[PDB]
Amino acid sequence: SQRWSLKAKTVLVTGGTKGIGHAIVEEFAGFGAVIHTCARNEYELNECLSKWQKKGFQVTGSVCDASLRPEREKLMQTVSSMFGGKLDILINNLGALDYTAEDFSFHISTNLESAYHLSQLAHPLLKASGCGNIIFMSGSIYSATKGALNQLARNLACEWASDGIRANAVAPAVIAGEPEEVSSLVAFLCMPAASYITGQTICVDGGLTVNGFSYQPQ
Amino acid sequence: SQRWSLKAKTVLVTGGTKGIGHAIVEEFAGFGAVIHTCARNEYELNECLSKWQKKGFQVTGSVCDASLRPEREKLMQTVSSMFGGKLDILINNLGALDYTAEDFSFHISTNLESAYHLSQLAHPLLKASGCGNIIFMSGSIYSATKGALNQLARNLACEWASDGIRANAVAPAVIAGEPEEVSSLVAFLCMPAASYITGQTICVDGGLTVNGFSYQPQ
Amino acid sequence: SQRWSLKAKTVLVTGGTKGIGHAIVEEFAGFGAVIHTCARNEYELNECLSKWQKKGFQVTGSVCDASLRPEREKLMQTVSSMFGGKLDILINNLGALDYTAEDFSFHISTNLESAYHLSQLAHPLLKASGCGNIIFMSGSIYSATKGALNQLARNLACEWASDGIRANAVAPAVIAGEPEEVSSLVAFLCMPAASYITGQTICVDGGLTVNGFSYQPQ
Amino acid sequence: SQRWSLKAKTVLVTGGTKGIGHAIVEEFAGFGAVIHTCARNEYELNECLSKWQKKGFQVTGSVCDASLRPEREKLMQTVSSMFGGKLDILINNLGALDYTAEDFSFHISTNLESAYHLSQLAHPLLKASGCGNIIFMSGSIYSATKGALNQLARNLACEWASDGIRANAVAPAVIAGEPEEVSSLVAFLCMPAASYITGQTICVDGGLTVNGFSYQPQ
Numbered sequence: 001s002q003r004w005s006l007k008a009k010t011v012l013v014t015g016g017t018k019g020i021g022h023a024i025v026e027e028f029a030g031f032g033a034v035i036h037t038c039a040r041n042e043y044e045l046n047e048c049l050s051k052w053q054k055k056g057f058q059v060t061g062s063v064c065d066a067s068l069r070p071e072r073e074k075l076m077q078t079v080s081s082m083f084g085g086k087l088d089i090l091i092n093n094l095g096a097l098d099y100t101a102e103d104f105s106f107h108i109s110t111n112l113e114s115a116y117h118l119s120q121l122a123h124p125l126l127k128a129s130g131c132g133n134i135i136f137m138s139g140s141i142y143s144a145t146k147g148a149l150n151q152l153a154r155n156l157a158c159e160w161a162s163d164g165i166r167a168n169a170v171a172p173a174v175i176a177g178e179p180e181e182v183s184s185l186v187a188f189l190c191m192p193a194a195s196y197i198t199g200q201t202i203c204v205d206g207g208l209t210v211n212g213f214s215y216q217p218q
Numbered sequence: 219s220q221r222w223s224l225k226a227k228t229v230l231v232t233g234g235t236k237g238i239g240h241a242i243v244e245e246f247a248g249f250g251a252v253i254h255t256c257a258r259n260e261y262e263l264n265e266c267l268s269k270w271q272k273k274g275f276q277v278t279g280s281v282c283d284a285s286l287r288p289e290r291e292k293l294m295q296t297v298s299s300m301f302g303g304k305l306d307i308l309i310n311n312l313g314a315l316d317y318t319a320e321d322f323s324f325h326i327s328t329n330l331e332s333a334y335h336l337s338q339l340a341h342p343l344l345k346a347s348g349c350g351n352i353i354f355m356s357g358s359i360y361s362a363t364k365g366a367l368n369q370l371a372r373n374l375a376c377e378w379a380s381d382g383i384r385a386n387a388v389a390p391a392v393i394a395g396e397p398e399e400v401s402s403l404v405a406f407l408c409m410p411a412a413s414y415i416t417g418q419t420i421c422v423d424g425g426l427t428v429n430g431f432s433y434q435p436q
Numbered sequence: 437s438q439r440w441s442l443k444a445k446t447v448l449v450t451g452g453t454k455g456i457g458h459a460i461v462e463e464f465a466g467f468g469a470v471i472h473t474c475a476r477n478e479y480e481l482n483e484c485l486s487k488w489q490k491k492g493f494q495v496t497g498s499v500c501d502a503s504l505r506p507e508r509e510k511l512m513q514t515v516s517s518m519f520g521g522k523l524d525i526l527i528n529n530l531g532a533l534d535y536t537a538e539d540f541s542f543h544i545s546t547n548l549e550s551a552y553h554l555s556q557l558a559h560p561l562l563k564a565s566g567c568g569n570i571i572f573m574s575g576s577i578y579s580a581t582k583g584a585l586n587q588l589a590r591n592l593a594c595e596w597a598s599d600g601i602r603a604n605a606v607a608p609a610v611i612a613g614e615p616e617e618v619s620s621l622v623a624f625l626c627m628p629a630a631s632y633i634t635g636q637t638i639c640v641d642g643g644l645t646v647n648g649f650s651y652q653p654q
Numbered sequence: 655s656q657r658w659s660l661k662a663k664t665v666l667v668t669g670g671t672k673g674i675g676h677a678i679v680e681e682f683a684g685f686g687a688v689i690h691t692c693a694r695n696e697y698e699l700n701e702c703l704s705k706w707q708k709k710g711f712q713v714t715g716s717v718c719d720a721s722l723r724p725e726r727e728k729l730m731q732t733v734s735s736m737f738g739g740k741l742d743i744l745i746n747n748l749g750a751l752d753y754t755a756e757d758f759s760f761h762i763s764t765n766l767e768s769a770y771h772l773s774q775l776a777h778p779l780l781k782a783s784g785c786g787n788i789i790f791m792s793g794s795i796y797s798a799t800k801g802a803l804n805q806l807a808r809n810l811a812c813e814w815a816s817d818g819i820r821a822n823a824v825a826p827a828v829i830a831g832e833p834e835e836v837s838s839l840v841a842f843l844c845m846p847a848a849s850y851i852t853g854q855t856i857c858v859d860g861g862l863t864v865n866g867f868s869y870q871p872q
Contacts, residue, residue, distance in 0.1 A: 001248075003402065004222075030219075069756075101771035102723075108802065109763025117755035139648010140809055147801030148762065151432060154872065155794055158427035174649045177414065184221065184411040193402040196395065199425035199434065207417035209376035212575010213610045214369060214654045215644075216417065218808065287538075319553035320505075326584065327545025335537035357866010358591055365583030366544065372654065373576055392867045430793010431828045432872045433862075436590065437684075439838065440658075466655075587868060594863035613850065620657065620847040629838040632831065635861035635870065643853035645812035650805060652853065 003193040006031035010129075011089040011190075012079050012122065013037045014066050016059075017044045020137055020172065021093040023180035027187045028089070029057035036079050038064035066095070066114055076121035087125030087132070089190050092118055094138035094145070107141055112148050119156060123165070132165035133190040137182075146171060147218075150201040157199035166195065171203035174217045221411040224249035228347075229307040229408075230297050230340065231255045232284050234277075235262045238355055238390065239311040241398035245405045246307070247275035254297050256282035284313070284332055294339035305343030305350070307408050310336055312356035312363070325359055330366050337374060341383070350383035351408040355400075364389060365436075368419040375417035384413065389421035392435045439629040442467035446565075447525040447626075448515050448558065449473045450502050452495075453480045456573055456608065457529040459616035463623045464525070465493035472515050474500035502531070502550055512557035523561030523568070525626050528554055530574035530581070543577055548584050555592060559601070568601035569626040573618075582607060583654075586637040593635035602631065607639035610653045657847040660685035664783075665743040665844075666733050666776065667691045668720050670713075671698045674791055674826065675747040677834035681841045682743070683711035690733050692718035720749070720768055730775035741779030741786070743844050746772055748792035748799070761795055766802050773810060777819070786819035787844040791836075800825060801872075804855040811853035820849065825857035828871045 011028050015021040016037030028035055029052065039045040042063045052059045060082065064075040079087060092115045099107075115136055126132030134156065136149045153169035160167065168189050172179040182204050188194055207216045229246050233239040234255030246253055247270065257263040260281045270277045278300065282293040297305060310333045317325075333354055344350030352374065354367045371387035378385065386407050390397040400422050406412055425434045447464050451457040452473030464471055465488065475481040478499045488495045496518065500511040515523060528551045535543075551572055562568030570592065572585045589605035596603065604625050608615040618640050624630055643652045665682050669675040670691030682689055683706065693699040696717045706713045714736065718729040733741060746769045753761075769790055780786030788810065790803045807823035814821065822843050826833040836858050842848055861870045 101767050101774065104770055105763040105767030108766060109759040112762060112798065113755050113759030116758055120755065139645065141648075143645075143649050143809055144766065144802050144805040147803075147805040148798050149801075151798040151801040151872070154425060154432040154434070155427060155430060155797055158425055158432060161424075173414070174646055174651075181414050184409075185415065188406045188411075191402075193406075196391070196399050197403065197422050199423070199432070200420065202418065202420070204415050205417070206379075207372060207376055208651075209373060209575065209579075210610055212373060212577075213579050214372040214376060214417070215610075215651050216372070216654060218650045218652060218805070319549050319556065322552055323545040323549030326548060327541040330544060330580065331537050331541030334540055338537065357863065359866075361591055361863075361867050362548065362584050362587040365585075365587040366580050367583075369580040369583040369654070373579055392864055392869075426869075427793065427797075428828055430795075431797050433828075433869050434872060436587070436868045436870060590861060590868040590870070591863060591866060594861055594868060597860075609850070617850050620845075621851065624842045624847075627838075629842075632827070632835050633839065633858050635859070635868070636856065638854065638856070640851050641853070642815075643808060643812055645809060648809060650808040650812060650853070652808070 004191050006033045006187060006191060009033045009088040010083040010086065011035040011091065012087060013091040013093060014118065015039065015093045015095050016061065017041070017048045020180055020183065022048065023183040024091055024093065024137070024186050025052070025059060027183035029059060031187060035059045036082060037061045038066065038075055040065050066118070067110060069117070072114065072118055072121055076118070080125055083125065085125060086128045087122055088129045090119065090122045090126060090134045091186065092134065092136045099141065104141060108145050108148060111138065111145050112152065115149065116152060123160070126165050127163040130164055131192065131195065132160070132163065134165065134167040135186055135189055136169040137186060138171070153201060154199045161198065166198035168198060168200045168202070173205045174203070175206040175208065222409050224251045224405060224409060227251045227306040228301040228304065229253040229309065230305060231309040231311060232336065233257065233311045233313050234279065235259070235266045238398055238401065240266065241401040242309055242311065242355070242404050243270070243277060245401035247277060249405060253277045254300060255279045256284065256293055258283050284336070285328060287335070290332065290336055290339055294336070298343055301343065303343060304346045305340055306347045308337065308340045308344060308352045309404065310352065310354045317359065322359060326363050326366060329356065329363050330370065333367065334370060341378070344383050345381040348382055349410065349413065350378070350381065352383065352385040353404055353407055354387040355404060356389070371419060372417045379416065384416035386416060386418045386420070391423045392421070393424040393426065440627050442469045442623060442627060445469045445524040446519040446522065447471040447527065448523060449527040449529060450554065451475065451529045451531050452497065453477070453484045456616055456619065458484065459619040460527055460529065460573070460622050461488070461495060463619035465495060467623060471495045472518060473497045474502065474511055476501050502554070503546060505553070508550065508554055508557055512554070516561055519561065521561060522564045523558055524565045526555065526558045526562060526570045527622065528570065528572045535577065540577060544581050544584060547574065547581050548588065551585065552588060559596070562601050563599040566600055567628065567631065568596070568599065570601065570603040571622055571625055572605040573622060574607070589637060590635045597634065602634035604634060604636045604638070609641045610639070611642040611644065658845050660687045660841060660845060663687045663742040664737040664740065665689040665745065666741060667745040667747060668772065669693065669747045669749050670715065671695070671702045674834055674837065676702065677837040678745055678747065678791070678840050679706070679713060681837035683713060685841060689713045690736060691715045692720065692729055694719050720772070721764060723771070726768065726772055726775055730772070734779055737779065739779060740782045741776055742783045744773065744776045744780060744788045745840065746788065746790045753795065758795060762799050762802060765792065765799050766806065769803065770806060777814070780819050781817040784818055785846065785849065786814070786817065788819065788821040789840055789843055790823040791840060792825070807855060808853045815852065820852035822852060822854045822856070827859045828857070829860040829862065
């Protein structure tokens with residue numbers, strides 16, 4: 001019922017034109033939520049937005065390069081004015097002949113910075129919502145990214161709970177049915193029915209055992 | 219929709235007259251699921267069953283001492299015949315001047331045995347369901363119990379997946395709104411929408427940080 | 437130097453005639469420590485004791501069935517009187533057509549009880565030592581055992597630190613050079629040089645990565 | 655004996671003039687190891703080097719700004735030529751009105767880059783040693799750093815084992831006797847006696863329990 005309802009909940013999802021982000025927009029839109037998304041390619045955006053309205057989904061978007069400071073500030077200003085200064089959900093969806101050290105550090109930090117900054121640009125809207133929710137949805141490079149994001153997630157959760165802001169991190173499977181099916185866990189975590197769930201770092205992996213001993217991603 | 223529907227799903231919940239078990243029966247019954255539960259006290263059972271039918275909940279029960287082998291075998295026989303040899307959900311809900319070694323080992327093992335045996339007595343019904351789901355819902359004594367159950371949970375999940383049987387473990391908060399609110403996570407995990415989620419050991423704790431460093435239950 | 441010296445440190449090691457226990461006796465004896473061990477087979481004991489004295493190792497032993505209460509009480513009485521009521525180290529080394537529920541619960545609990553009880557029978561000697569050290573050295577059955585012991589280990593460590601008693605758990609590799617080489621980690625953990633190390637649950641596994649993502653035993 | 659000997663083992667320790675690094679140089683030098691260290695302040699270096707030679711410690715150093723690419727390349731060239739192209743140990747010791755996003759991402763990534771690059775600049779010397787060893791020794795900012803480094807550590811360990819290169823990460827206590835006492839664990843991990851230990855992420859924390867439930871840093 002009302003506990004499992006996302007109806008009319010305002011959602012900001014970054015990178016909503018593909019992969020997990022697109023699946024997350026669909027999932028939330030399936031629950032009749034109001035979503036704003038973004039993408040660098042204005043053609044793919046309008047392209048996804050079109051297909052969405054033809055499904056009864058209420059989604060708006062903007063051409064933002066989430067890797068740029070002024071872009072993240074503009075995006076959040078566009079979100080506040082359209083949601084009336086209040087934001088219920090924030091889905092920090094990070095984007096995707098061998099990588100060097102500079103590239104390794106550039107990609108891992110850029111991801112963390114973008115995520116850490118967007119969370120700060122959204123705080124006021126989230127806190128004003130009364131039931132704020134944040135979810136960080138994101139080898140070699142990836143793994144180190146995971147470890148980095150899991151910590152930030154749990155750190156924030158241990159810092160904004162009084163403002164009523166919960167934060168959790170979700171990771172796709174490493175071993176398996178689509179990996180994009182994880183969108184339903186993302187949705188549930190943001191439901192009022194999951195208000196007590198915060199600081200969780202969940203990876204929906206197939207998991208495995210050896211001779212009877214468990215083994216899973218870290 | 220159908221992905222988040224538990225409608226007409228058959229559920230066996232042990233210890234459903236109190237605490238978490240009672241909350242789990244309510245949660246599943248709220249979703250219009252068909253549940254069978256048990257309890258040693260036939261008065262508390264009929265007492266809970268009465269209040270339930272007056273709420274439109276479809277729950278049946280039996281007086282079982284889940285700590286006794288013949289009782290667990292009788293309980294499962296009562297479940298099969300009433301659900302037609304098929305069982306969708308199994309909620310292994312364990313029950314609750316200082317404890318000695320014998321008592322320490324007696325309580326931790328008794329809990330594990332009961333849970334491990336009930337899972338085996340239910341396998342055929344679960345497998346026959348096509349979408350089997352098991353969830354193990356359960357200081358000093360408790361902690362060691364947790365560690366024990368988490369392993370069994372992940373072990374089974376790494377063993378019955380081919381039969382379509384998923385298994386997860388859920389723990390109540392150590393630090394916080396009722397702890398019984400965790401029933402909604404229990405319900406979601408059993409939904410078709412969460413079919414890809416298995417081998418998870420989740421403790422919905424308030425969590426905490428020190429000087430900025432995270433800290434959570436193990 | 438003195439920080440990495442185990443010289444004249446009294447050690448109780450259960451099951452010291454084979455596998456890890458025998459390796460642990462050798463390791464500590466290599467550091468010139470005074471050890472007392474036990475075994476059900478009095479022939480294998482005298483057999484190992486003989487070979488040891490011919491190596492300059494100072495080890496004594498007794499025929500104890502560590503699975504029996506009166507045996508554990510007798511063993512510890514034999515240890516106190518020979519070490520003068522003080523014990524520096526305690527190595528809880530647990531011992532090793534498909535297992536049933538009763539056997540599953542009987543083996544996991546028996547292991548935990550024996551370990552939990554021996555730790556209590558040794559407390560006074562450990563505390564009196566001033567620098568007490570305990571290490572719990574121990575599929576399906578095993579994994580659940582691990583989870584159980586890891587918790588007890590960390591629980592005790594969080595309870596006897598004021599008496600100067602540290603406690604850690606060590607597990608052999610699941611995937612690799614002998615697994616018995618872990619005896620050196622066991623020795624180091626008990627050194628004064630490792631006095632600040634407690635509550636650790638270490639499994640020296642070969643570990644592995646998939647497509648770049650880490651994976652290890654739980 | 656030889657298994658626990660670090661005698662004549664060549665060691666590169668970054669930031670060896672203070673805190674943990676200085677303690678690590680002392681620990682290894684106590685075992686009569688040959689160490690090369692670095693520091694931005696040439697006065698503090700010569701200052702520490704002086705006090706060291708007056709203790710019989712064999713340590714050399716260079717003024718390197720480990721945060722600069724050309725500096726890390728120069729440092730490693732200075733190490734190879736003095737150790738004859740072979741390096742046994744590599745201790746990646748990272749260095750230390752509220753931080754912003756750019757600073758947050760700049761510090762976490764800079765630390766990871768420096769560590770990831772130094773490991774690559776040392777590989778050939780390590781591999782040529784035959785028994786290569788690497789140890790990464792390193793709120794809010796720190797925690798995320800930890801998560802990042804733990805992953806890289808385990809990733810590398812899962813990549814250079816065939817070359818005989820082991821890698822582990824060690825973290826100081828969050829809650830307690832000096833935190834610099836962890837230098838002995840660092841030394842042990844690099845000993846031949848610990849050749850089978852790799853992929854470990856150890857934090858020597860005091861740990862704690864609540865009502866009997868364990869709780870530790872992640």
